[PDB]
Ligand binder design. Structure first.
Ligand SMILES: Nc1nc2c(c(=O)[nH]1)N[C@H]1C(S)=C(S)[C@@H](COP(=O)(O)OP(=O)(O)OC[C@H]3O[C@@H](n4cnc5c(=O)[nH]c(N)nc54)[C@H](O)[C@@H]3O)O[C@H]1N2
Ligand SMILES: Nc1nc2c(c(=O)[nH]1)N[C@H]1C(S)=C(S)[C@@H](COP(=O)(O)OP(=O)(O)OC[C@H]3O[C@@H](n4cnc5c(=O)[nH]c(N)nc54)[C@H](O)[C@@H]3O)O[C@H]1N2
Ligand SMILES: Cc1cc2nc3c(=O)[nH]c(=O)nc-3n(C[C@H](O)[C@H](O)[C@H](O)COP(=O)(O)O)c2cc1C
Ligand code: SF4
Ligand code: SF4
Ligand code: SF4
Ligand code: SF4
Ligand code: FES
Ligand code: FES
Ligand SMILES: [W+6]
Lengths: 911, 557
C-alpha cells in the first residue's frame, strides 16, 4: 500500500488521487472522468485539480496516482479557486439550466458543489441542434469537450464514429466528416449518451421539440435484454408504467455496454398490436397458405373469448387429435426467447401431455449442425470459453459470423483485444464486414467452400509439423485418420476451390497454430449448409490438433444467437434428449424421468422442425402447439411451410402479436413479453442470469408458464406451480448443470456461470482444461470431405442467394418492426448486391428488383454494398412484404437437420 | 403482395450507413500514393500530398484515403481539420481558388500595417482565382509586413509588389545561395561527427564539452543540452531522435536563418546527437511556412552518404506542434494534442520509445562547441552570464534581424550595440523579450540581463529570445490583444483553462475597459491548471501589461 497525506490526514491507496478521495468520503468535482469500467481518465477538463506540495503547478487528481511521501491538498484556496474557475468557464457557454437538455446533469451537479450558479464570462455562440437521428438528439451547445463520447465510441465500443475535430474553442464533436448523426456510420449503440455528463447527447425520447428535457422516469428495473445471446444486463426506465429508455448495467457479459436493439428496441411491448384477449378462429373461416390477417383487426378471422373457453378449445383440439389419431399426430415448437422454466414446462407438456418427443425450437435451424459435431467429437453442447476470452487470445478467428451486426457488445471486446492487446483478428466470410477494418487478415472466400479452405489449413499444420504432439497424445483420438486423408487438400489445389491464394492459406494456418493462444468464433455462415456439420468438424479439428483449447484465450465459441437458445436446449426443448442432454432412447435415462414424473415416456426420439413440416404434408401431424416461434416466416421454403400450417386440423399459437403463424391458428393465446416475466436465461457463455418483471402485461395477457400449466391441467396433468421459482426448484433435481445454482443465489448475485463447484466460488468459464466428458476422456477428430451445396448456380439462376441479418432487426421482424426506433432505421425490405452487379442489371442504388428462385419470387429494393461479392445477393429474412424464406432451399444437413439458408441459386430481373 | 407490421411510412437507405467511398477517387488516390506506405504515421504527409496535387482535400479524396489506410472517417477528418493549412471541401462547398495569398497578422507585421494590408489585398485581388487570408507569424518579422503568394514570401510587401507577384505568376519559393555539401566539407565539415562515430573522439568527451560549455535549450526552455543527452542515452533502447523545426513563436526567425545559409552545420550537430543517444532514425519536423528551408534540406540530405535514416516531415499550420509532446503526436500522424507529464518525452516519447528532441539552433552549435572547446563558448557573455545567443530582433529598430551576440545583454545594449538604436521618429516604449509567450516589459526596465533565468523575477522569460521592440507609436494593450488572438487561435483545444480561457480573455480585452480583476483570476487559473506551456504562458502578456503599464488603465475598478 502507498501511504500518503491527503488534506492533513495520513491515508493509504491501491488507484488515483481522485479515487482515494471518493473512498475516504471527499468528493472532488469531476467532469471528463467517468468512474466506470472502460473509461480510462483523460485529464482534459481540469475540474478535479488538487495541490501537491513541492510541485509548481496543480495536478488533475483523476490522472495522478499517489506516491510515498506525497502531500496532497484539495481544500486549499488555490486548488478550489482553479476548480470553480474551470466550472465558471464552462457555465458561460451552457444553456440556461432550467430549460436545458438535462437540468439534472452530472455537469450541473458538479457546478452546484462549487456554488457556481452563474458566470461572469461572456457566452460564445456555438453549434445548432442535430436531431436527424430518431433515437438520439445532439445539442452540442451544452458540450464541454470532455471527449467522454469519443472514448465511449472509439475505445469502449470501437465503433469508430465520433471524433473531436478542428482546434481551440472550435473543437467540436463530429460524426464521420462532421456529417449528421442520422446519416453517418453511427450504429446507435448509445454508449456516447450514457457517458455524456452535460446533456449534449440525450435520448430523443427525453426531449421536447425545443430540446428541453421533459421525461423523468418514476422508477428503474434491472433485468436482461430480450434479444440476442450476449445476455446484456439492462436497467429499464419506466415512466407512468411505460418503458421510455434503457441503460447498460455492469453485468458480467456487457460491462454497461449495449447495442441499438437493447437500448432502444424495448417498445414492442407497448405496440398497439399487442394481443390482450384470447382469440378463437371464426367457425366458418377456412385456412389458406397465402391468407393474411390484419394484426390491428383480427375480427375478420377471429372472435375474442374468455381464457376459460380459449384454453378449453386449445387443449380440446389437441386432446381430440391425441385421443383419436394418437400421440404421433402432435408436435410442439418452443421458444428460445422464453425463460428456462418455460422451456422445461413446454418440453414436459409435450412429453407428458402429448405423450411424444415431437418437441423442438429454433435451434434446429441454427447451431444444430455445430452442436452435432461438438457432441460427436467432444460430447459437448456448449462453448469452451466465454467471448471475453478473446481479450487473452493472441489470434482471434471469426468465421461465418458477423458479430458487429449480430453480437455487437461481444464484438466490442474483440475490437478491444485488437486495439489494446494486439490480437490478430482473422475474419473468414464471403462478405466484408465493418469488423474487417481492424482485422489482420480477411479471407473473402467463395460462398460454400469452408471445407476446402479449412482443410488447406489443417494440411499446412499437419505437413509442416506445427501440431501439439503433447496434446494429441493426451487428449485426442483418430488423429492418424486425419494425416492419411488430409494429404489431398493442399493449399495449392484448394486455392481455386475457395478463392484464397495458397500463400495466404499457409500464413493463416501457421499464424493460428504457432500462437500461444487462439480462439475461434463461428455462426450461421458455418452451420447453415447441407454440409454444415462438416464445416464444424474442420473447425474442431483445428482446435484439437493444435491444442488451442482448454486454456485462457483459447477454445471454440459457436455464438449462440437467441437470448435463451442455450438455456432452452439445456432444459430439453429438443426432440432427442431430456434436460441436460440425456438421451431419451437410453432406457436408464428414460426410466429415471419416468419415476421422477410418474408416467411412461416415449423411448423413440421425435422429429425435428423441418421433419415435422414434411410430416404435416404426409397427413401424419395434425395438431400443433406453437409458443414464441414464428415459423411462417423463419422456416425455409415458405410456400410449402405456410401450406403445411394451413392443413393442420388444429393450431394453437401463443405469442405477443398476431404473427404470420397465428394467421393460420385455431386458438391464439396472448402471452407475456420478456420485460413482463421473471425467470432464468442462459447466454452464449453459459452464464445463467435471472430476469425480473419491469411492467405488467397489457390487458389480459398472461404469463407464459401460467398458460402452459393451464393447458397441462386440461390434458390430465395435475400441476400447481406458483411461478418460475417453483419450476426452477424442480429442474435443479434433474439438471446437474444447475448444481450450486439456486434461485436465492441468482437473486443476490444476478448471474452465475455453469458448471459451478461450490455455492461461493465462481463458475468454470473455461472448460475442457483436463479432458472431455467422453468415455475415454479424449476428443475424437473427424475428417471431412468437400460436399457441394444442394443447389448451385446455372444459366437460369446464375446468382448465389445468401440470407441473414441486419443490426436493427430481429429474425422474422414481428418484434423489431414494432419497435419505433428500429423500424425507422430499417423501414423497408432491401437486399444487398455489389455495385458492379447493379450496373450490369441497369439498376440504380435504391431501385426495385425481382428476386426469383425455383421456389418463389419477391420484389424489393436493392442496396448497393461493395462489401458484397460479385455474383452474390444477400438478403435479411425479416421483411414480410418480401419474405426471404419464400426463396430458400429447404435441403437439410443429414446429421444436424438444418436447412441451407446460406446458399441457393437465384436470378435477378429489374422491376 | 403481403403487408408487414412496420409503419410503412419511410424508405430504406439505398447504400450502407454514412458516406461512401467513390471508386474514381479511390482509383485516383491509389495512383497518387503509388507505393508509399499506408502506415498511420504518414497521414499528415499524405494529406500534404493530396493538398499539393489538387490544391485542396475534397471529401471524396479524404474518404478514399481513410479507406486505403484502414482508418475511420472521423480519424482522418479529426487530424486533417486540426491543421490550418488543410482545406477540406465537403458536399455543397465551393472549391479552393487556384492561388492562395497569405498575409501575416502577428505582432510585428501588425505594427507595420498588416490589418490594413489584408483589407486592401482583399478588395483589390480576392476573386474566384485568388484567395486572400490571414496567417500567424511566418518567421519574417525582420521583413514585416510579410505576405505569401503561393509558396513565395514577399518581404516589406505592399499592394504593388503583391499585385506584381500575382500578375507575374511568381508563386514558387526562391532558393537563395547557401553552403552546400561540397562547400561544407571543404571547410572541414563532417569531421567532428566522423571522429565521434569512428571512435577517436569519445562520446563521453562530447557530453563533457556540452556540460562545461553550458549549452542550453535554444528552443526556448533552456534545459541543459548535455543533461538531456545523458538522460536519453541512460534509457533502454531502442531510441529515436526528433528535430524541432517548427519555429512558430511570433518574433522568432533564427532557425530559418541558419537553415538557409549553412544547413549541414545543423545536420552534423544533429547526426552527432543521433550518435550519442544511438538513434536508429532521426525525424526533422520542419514547419510548413519554410518552403525555402524545405527544398534546401531535401537537396542536401540526398547529397549525404548512405548511416542514420533521416526522415524530413512537414508541419501543416500549428504553433502547438512546437511543444515536444505535440510534435511527437504530429509525427505519429495524429492531432497535435500535448501529452500529460509524467512520463516525459526523453523516456516515453515518439512511438513510446525514449526520444531525444532538440531545436534547430541547439544542434547548430554542437560542432563549434566541440572543435573550439567549452572555454571559447563561456568567454562570451555580459553582466555575469556566459555563452552566445541568437536574438531575433524585430520592431522599431533601425537594423532588425538575427543578432548572434553575448548572453546577458540588456535590451538597451542589444538595441544600441547591435540594432542601430530605435527607428527614426520612434521612442522606446515596450519590448517582448520572449516573443508572444514571454510577456511585455516597459522601456524603463531596460537594465535587466537577458538570458535564461534572469526574467522570471519579473514574470517574464527569455524563451526563444524573439525580441520585439515597441514604441510610443505602437499600442501596448493592442499588442497584448494581438498575442491573445494568436493563442486563442493556436490553442489545441484539449483543456478548459486554455481552450475557454484564451477565448474568454480575448473577448474581455476587446471591451473599451479591461476588467483587470477578472483577467487576474483567469490568468491565475490558466497558468495553474493548463496542461502544457501554451496555456500556462498565454496570459503572460496580459499579466505584465496590467502590472507594468498602470497608465494604460485610467478608469477605476
Ligand atoms: N441484429 C440482429 N442480431 C442477431 C439476430 C437477428 O435476427 N438480428 N439473430 C440472432 C440469431 S438467433 C443467430 S443464430 C445469430 C446469427 O449470427 P450470424 O452468424 O453472425 O448471422 P448471419 O448474418 O447469418 O452471419 C452469417 C455470416 O456468414 C457469411 N456467409 C455467407 N455464406 C457463407 C459460407 O458459405 N461460409 C462461411 N464461413 N460464411 C458465409 C455471411 O456473409 C454472414 O455474414 O445472430 C443473433 N443475433
Ligand atoms: N432465410 C433464413 N432463415 C432463417 C435464418 C437465416 O439466417 N436465414 N436463421 C434461422 C435462425 S438462426 C433461427 S434461430 C430462426 C428464428 O426463428 P423464430 O424463432 O421463429 O424467429 P423470431 O422472430 O425470434 O420468433 C419469436 C416469436 O415469439 C414472439 N415472442 C417474443 N417474445 C415472446 C415472449 O416472451 N413470450 C411469447 N409467448 N412469445 C414471444 C415473438 O413475437 C416472435 O413471433 O430463423 C431461422 N431462419
Ligand atoms: C507552446 C510551445 C511552443 C513551442 N514551440 C517551439 C518551437 O517553435 N521551436 C522549438 O525549438 N521549441 C519550441 N518549444 C520548446 C519545445 O517544447 C522543446 O523544449 C524543444 O523543441 C527542444 O528543446 P531544446 O531547446 O532543448 O532543443 C515550445 C514549447 C511550448 C511551450
Ligand atoms: S458531447 Fe457530452 S461527452 Fe461528448 S464531449 Fe461534448 S460533453 Fe463531453
Ligand atoms: S451511438 Fe454508439 S455509435 Fe453512434 S456515436 Fe454514440 S457511440 Fe458511436
Ligand atoms: S448485444 Fe445482444 S444482448 Fe446486448 S444489447 Fe444488443 S442485443 Fe441485447
Ligand atoms: S494548454 Fe491545454 S489546450 Fe492549450 S494547448 Fe496545452 S493542452 Fe491544448
Ligand atoms: S476530471 Fe480530472 S481532469 Fe477532467
Ligand atoms: S512574420 Fe508577421 S510577425 Fe513574424
Ligand atoms: W439462431
Amino acid at each position: 500500500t502507498i501511504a500518503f497525506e491527503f488534506d492533513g490526514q495520513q491515508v493509504e491507496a491501491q488507484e488515483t488521487i481522485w479515487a482515494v478521495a471518493k473512498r475516504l468520503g471527499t468528493h472532488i468535482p469531476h467532469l471528463c472522468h467517468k468512474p466506470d469500467p472502460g473509461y480510462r481518465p483523460d485529464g482534459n477538463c481540469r475540474a478535479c485539480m488538487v495541490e501537491i506540495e513541492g510541485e509548481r503547478v496543480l495536478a488533475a487528481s483523476c490522472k495522478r496516482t499517489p506516491a510515498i511521501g506525497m502531500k496532497v491538498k484539495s481544500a486549499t484556496e488555490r486548488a478550489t479557486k482553479a476548480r470553480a474557475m474551470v466550472l465558471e468557464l464552462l457555465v458561460a457557454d451552457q444553456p440556461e439550466r432550467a430549460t436545458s437538455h438535462d437540468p439534472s446533469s452530472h455537469f450541473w451537479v458538479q457546478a452546484d458543489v462549487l456554488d457556481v450558479t452563474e458566470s461572469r464570462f461572456p457566452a460564445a455562440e456555438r453549434w445548432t441542434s442535430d436531431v436527424s437521428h430518431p433515437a438520439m438528439s445532439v445539442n452540442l451547445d451544452a458540450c464541454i469537450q470532455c471527449n467522454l463520447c469519443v472514448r465511449a465510441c472509439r475505445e469502449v465500443q470501437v465503433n469508430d464514429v465520433i471524433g473531436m475535430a478542428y482546434r481551440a474553442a472550435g473543437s467540436k464533436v463530429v460524426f464521420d466528416f462532421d456529417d449528421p448523426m442520422g446519416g453517418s456510420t453511427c450504429v446507435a449503440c448509445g454508449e456516447c449518451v450514457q457517458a455524456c455528463p452535460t446533456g449534449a447527447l440525450m435520448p430523443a425520447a427525453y426531449l421536447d421539440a425545443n430540446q428541453t428535457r421533459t421525461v423523468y422516469p418514476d422508477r428503474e428495473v434491472k433485468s436482461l435484454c430480450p434479444y440476442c445471446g450476449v445476455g446484456c444486463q439492462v436497467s429499464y426506465k419506466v415512466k407512468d408504467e411505460r418503458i421510455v429508455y434503457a441503460e447498460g448495467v455492469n453485468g458480467p457479459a456487457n460491462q454497461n455496454r449495449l447495442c441499438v436493439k437493447g437500448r432502444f428496441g424495448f417498445d414492442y411491448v407497448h405496440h398497439p398490436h399487442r394481443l390482450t384477449v384470447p382469440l378463437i378462429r371464426l367457425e366458418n373461416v377456412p385456412k389458406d397458405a397465402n391468407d393474411q390477417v390484419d394484426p390491428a383487426n383480427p375480427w375478420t378471422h377471429f372472435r375474442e373469448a374468455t381464457w376459460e373457453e380459449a384454453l378449453d378449445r386449445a387443449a380440446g383440439g389437441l386432446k381430440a387429435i391425441r385421443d383419436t389419431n394418437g400421440r404421433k399426430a402432435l408436435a410442439g415448437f418452443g421458444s428460445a426467447k422464453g425463460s428456462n422454466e418455460e422451456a422445461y414446462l413446454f418440453q414436459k407438456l409435450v412429453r407428458l401431455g402429448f405423450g411424444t418427443n415431437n418437441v423442438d425450437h429454433c435451434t434446429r435451424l441454427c447451431h444444430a449442425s455445430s452442436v452435432a459435431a461438438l457432441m460427436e467429437g467432444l460430447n459437448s453442447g456448449a462453448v469452451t470459453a466465454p467471448f471475453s476470452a478473446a481479450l487473452d487470445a493472441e489470434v482471434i478467428v471469426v468465421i461465418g459470423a458477423n458479430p458487429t451486426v449480430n453480437h455487437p457488445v461481444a464484438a466490442t471486446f474483440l475490437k478491444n483485444a485488437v486495439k489494446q492487446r494486439g490480437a490478430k483478428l482473422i475474419i473468414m466470410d464471403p462478405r466484408r464486414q465493418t469488423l474487417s477494418r481492424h482485422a489482420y487478415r480477411h479471407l473473402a472466400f467463395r460462398p460454400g467452400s469452408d471445407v476446402a479452405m479449412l482443410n488447406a489449413m489443417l494440411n499446412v499444420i499437419v505437413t509442416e509439423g506445427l501440431y501439439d504432439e503433447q496434446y494429441i497424445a493426451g487428449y485426442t483420438e483418430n488423429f492418424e485418420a486425419l494425416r492419411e486423408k488430409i494429404v489431398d487438400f493442399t493449399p495449392e489445389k484448394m486455392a481455386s476451390v475457395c478463392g484464397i491464394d495458397a500463400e495466404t492459406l499457409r500464413e493463416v494456418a501457421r499464424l493460428y497454430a504457432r500462437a500461444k493462444s487462439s480462439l475461434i468464433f463461428w455462426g450461421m455462415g458455418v452451420s447453415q449448409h447441407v454440409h454444415g456439420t462438416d464445416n464444424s468438424r474442420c473447425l474442431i479439428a483445428l482446435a484439437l490438433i493444435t491444442g488451442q483449447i482448454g486454456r485462457p484465450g483459447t477454445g471454440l465459441h459457436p455464438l449462440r444467437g437467441q437470448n435463451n437458445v442455450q438455456g432452452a436446449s439445456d432444459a430439453g426443448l429438443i426432440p432427442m434428449v431430456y434436460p441436460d442432454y440425456q438421451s431419451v432412447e437410453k432406457d436408464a435415462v428414460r426410466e429415471l424421468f419416468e419415476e421422477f414424473w410418474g408416467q411412461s415416456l416415449d423411448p423413440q426420439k421425435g422429429l425435428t422442425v423441418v421433419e415435422i413440416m414434411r410430416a404435416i404434408h404426409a397427413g401424419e401431424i395434425r395438431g400443433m402447439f406453437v409458443e414464441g416461434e414464428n415459423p411462417a416466416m423463419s422456416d425455409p421454403d415458405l410456400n410449402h411451410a405456410r401450406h403445411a400450417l394451413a392443413m393442420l386440423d388444429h393450431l394453437v399459437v401463443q405469442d405477443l402479436f398476431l404473427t404470420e403463424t397465428a394467421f393460420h391458428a385455431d386458438v391464439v393465446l396472448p402471452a407475456s413479453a420478456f420485460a413482463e416475466k421473471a425467470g432464468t436465461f442462459t447466454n452464449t457463455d453459459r452464464r445463467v442470469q435471472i430476469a425480473q418483471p419491469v411492467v405488467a402485461p397489457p390487458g389480459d395477457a398472461r404469463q407464459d408458464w401460467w398458460i402452459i400449466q393451464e393447458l397441462a391441467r386440461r390434458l390430465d396433468l395435475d400441476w400447481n406451480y406458483g411461478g418460475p421459482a417453483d419450476i426452477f426448484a424442480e429442474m435443479a433435481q434433474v439438471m446437474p448443470s444447475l448444481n450450486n445454482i439456486t434461485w436465492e443465489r441468482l437473486e443476490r448475485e444476478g448471474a452465475v456461470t455453469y458448471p459451478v463447484d461450490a455455492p461461493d466460488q465462481p463458475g468454470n468459464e473455461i472448460i475442457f482444461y483436463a479432458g472431455f466428458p467422453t468415455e475415454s476422456g479424449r476428443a475424437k477428430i473427424v475428417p471431412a470431405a468437400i460436399v457441394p451445396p444442394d443447389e448451385v448456380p446455372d444459366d437460369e439462376f446464375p446468382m448465389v442467394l445468401s440470407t441473414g441479418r441486419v443490426l436493427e432487426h430481429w429474425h422474422t421482424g414481428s418484434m423489431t418492426r414494432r419497435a419505433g426506433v428500429l423500424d425507422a432505421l430499417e423501414p423497408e425490405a432491401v437486399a444487398f448486391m455489389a455495385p458492379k452487379e447493379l450496373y450490369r442489371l441497369g439498376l440504380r442504388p435504391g431501385g426495385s428488383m425481382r428476386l426469383e428462385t425455383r421456389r418463389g419470387a419477391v420484389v424489393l429494393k436493392v442496396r448497393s454494398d461493395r462489401d458484397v461479392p460479385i455474383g452474390m445477393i444477400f438478403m435479411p429474412f425479416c421483411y414480410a412484404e418480401a419474405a426471404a424464406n419464400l426463396l430458400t432451399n429447404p435441403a437439410l444437413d443429414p446429421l444436424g437437420k438444418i436447412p441451407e439458408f446460406k446458399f441457393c441459386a437465384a436470378r435477378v430481373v429489374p422491376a | 403482395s403481403f403487408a408487414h407490421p412496420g409503419r410503412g411510412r419511410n424508405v430504406a437507405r439505398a447504400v450502407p450507413k454514412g458516406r461512401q467511398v467513390d471508386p474514381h477517387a479511390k482509383v485516383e488516390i491509389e495512383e497518387l500514393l503509388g507505393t508509399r506506405p499506408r502506415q498511420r504515421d504518414l497521414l499528415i504527409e499524405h494529406l500534404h500530398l493530396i493538398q499539393d496535387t489538387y490544391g485542396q482535400i475534397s471529401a471524396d479524396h479524404l474518404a478514399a484515403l481513410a479507406d486505403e489506410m484502414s482508418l475511420a472517417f472521423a480519424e482522418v477528418f479529426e487530424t486533417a481539420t486540426f491543421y490550418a493549412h488543410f482545406d477540406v471541401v465537403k458536399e455543397g462547398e465551393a472549391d479552393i481558388p487556384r492561388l492562395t495569398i497569405r498575409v501575416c497578422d502577428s505582432i510585428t507585421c501588425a505594427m507595420f500595417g498588416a490589418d490594413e494590408l489584408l483589407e486592401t489585398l482583399q478588395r483589390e485581388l480576392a476573386s474566384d482565382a485568388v484567395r486572400v487570408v490571414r496567417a500567424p507569424c511566418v518567421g519574417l518579422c525582420d521583413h514585416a509586413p510579410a505576405v505569401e503568394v503561393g509558396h513565395n514570401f514577399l518581404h516589406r510587401a505592399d499592394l504593388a509588389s503583391v499585385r506584381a507577384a500575382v500578375e507575374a505568376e511568381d508563386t514558387h519559393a526562391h532558393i537563395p545561395t547557401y553552403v552546400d555539401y561540397d562547400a561544407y566539407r571543404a571547410g572541414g565539415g563532417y569531421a567532428t561527427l566522423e571522429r565521434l562515430r569512428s571512435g577517436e573522439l569519445p562520446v563521453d568527451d562530447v557530453l563533457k564539452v556540452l556540460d562545461d560549455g553550458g549549452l542550453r535549450g535554444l528552443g526556448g526552455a533552456g534545459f541543459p543540452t548535455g543533461r538531456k543527452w545523458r538522460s536519453v542515452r541512460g534509457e533502454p533502447g531502442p531510441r529515436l531522435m526528433a528535430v524541432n523545426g517548427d519555429e512558430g513563436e511570433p518574433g522568432t526567425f533564427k532557425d530559418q536563418l541558419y537553415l538557409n545559409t549553412d544547413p549541414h552545420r545543423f545536420l552534423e550537430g544533429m547526426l552527432i546527437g543521433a550518435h550519442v543517444v544511438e538513434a536508429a532514425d532521426v525525424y526533422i519536423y520542419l514547419r510548413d511556412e519554410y518552403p525555402i528551408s524545405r527544398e534546401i534540406l531535401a537537396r542536401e540530405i540526398a547529397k549525404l552518404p548512405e548511416g542514420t535514416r533521416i526522415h524530413l516531415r512537414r508541419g501543416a499550420g500549428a504553433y502547438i506542434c512546437g511543444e515536444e509532446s505535440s510534435l511527437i503526436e504530429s509525427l505519429e500522424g495524429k492531432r497535435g494534442l500535448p501529452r500529460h507529464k509524467p512520463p516525459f518525452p526523453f523516456q516515453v516519447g515518439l512511438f513510446n520509445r525514449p526520444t531525444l528532441i532538440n531545436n534547430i539552433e541547439t544542434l547548430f552549435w554542437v560542432r563549434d562547441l566541440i572543435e573550439r572547446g567549452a572555454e571559447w563558448w563561456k568567454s562570451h557573455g555580459r553582466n555575469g552570464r556566459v555563452g552566445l545567443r541568437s536574438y531575433s530582433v524585430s520592431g522599431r529598430v533601425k537594423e532588425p534581424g538575427v543578432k548572434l551576440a553575448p548572453a546577458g545583454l540588456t535590451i538597451q545594449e542589444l538595441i544600441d550595440e547591435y540594432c542601430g538604436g530605435i527607428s527614426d521618429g520612434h521612442s522606446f516604449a515596450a519590448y517582448l523579450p520572449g516573443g508572444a509567450s514571454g510577456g511585455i516589459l516597459p522601456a524603463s526596465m531596460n537594465d535587466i540581463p537577458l538570458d535564461f533565468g534572469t526574467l522570471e523575477k519579473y514574470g517574464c522569460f527569455i524563451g526563444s529570445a524573439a525580441v520585439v521592440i515597441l514604441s510610443d507609436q505602437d499600442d501596448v494593450r493592442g499588442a497584448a490583444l494581438n498575442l491573445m488572438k494568436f493563442f486563442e487561435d493556436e490553442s489545441c483545444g484539449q483543456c478548459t483553462p486554455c481552450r475557454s480561457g484564451t477565448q474568454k480573455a480575448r473577448m474581455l480585452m476587446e471591451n473599451g475597459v479591461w476588467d483587470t480583476d477578472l483577467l487576474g483570476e483567469l490568468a491565475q487559473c490558466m497558468r495553474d491548471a493548463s496542461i502544457c506551456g501554451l496555456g500556462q504562458a498565454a496570459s503572460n502578456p496580459v499579466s505584465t501589461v496590467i502590472k507594468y503599464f498602470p497608465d494604460l488603465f485610467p478608469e477605476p475598478r
